[PDB]
Coordinates of C-alpha atoms in Angstrom, one line a residue:
X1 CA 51.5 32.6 39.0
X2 CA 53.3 29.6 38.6
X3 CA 51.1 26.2 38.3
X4 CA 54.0 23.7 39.2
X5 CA 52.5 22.2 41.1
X6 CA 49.5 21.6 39.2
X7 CA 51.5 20.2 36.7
X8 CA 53.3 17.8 39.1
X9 CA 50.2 16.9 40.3
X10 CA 48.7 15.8 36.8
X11 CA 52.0 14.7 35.3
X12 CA 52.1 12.6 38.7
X13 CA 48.1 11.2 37.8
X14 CA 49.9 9.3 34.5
X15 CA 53.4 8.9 36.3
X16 CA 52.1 7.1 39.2
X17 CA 54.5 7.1 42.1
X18 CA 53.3 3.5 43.5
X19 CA 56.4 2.1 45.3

Protein backbone atom coordinates (compact mmCIF):
# COMPACT_ATOMS: atom_id res chain seq x y z
CA UNK A 1 0.00 0.00 0.00
CA UNK A 2 0.98 3.38 -0.19
CA UNK A 3 2.21 5.08 3.26
CA UNK A 4 1.60 8.92 2.11
CA UNK A 5 0.25 9.69 4.43
CA UNK A 6 2.49 8.41 7.03
CA UNK A 7 5.02 10.23 5.46
CA UNK A 8 3.11 13.52 5.52
CA UNK A 9 2.37 12.95 8.79
CA UNK A 10 6.11 12.58 10.06
CA UNK A 11 7.55 14.91 7.35
CA UNK A 12 4.71 17.32 8.98
CA UNK A 13 6.29 16.36 12.86
CA UNK A 14 9.69 18.38 11.64
CA UNK A 15 7.78 20.66 9.14
CA UNK A 16 5.43 22.10 11.62
CA UNK A 17 2.46 23.71 10.13
CA UNK A 18 1.98 26.37 13.09
CA UNK A 19 0.36 29.44 11.39
Amino acid sequence: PMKKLKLALRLAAKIAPVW
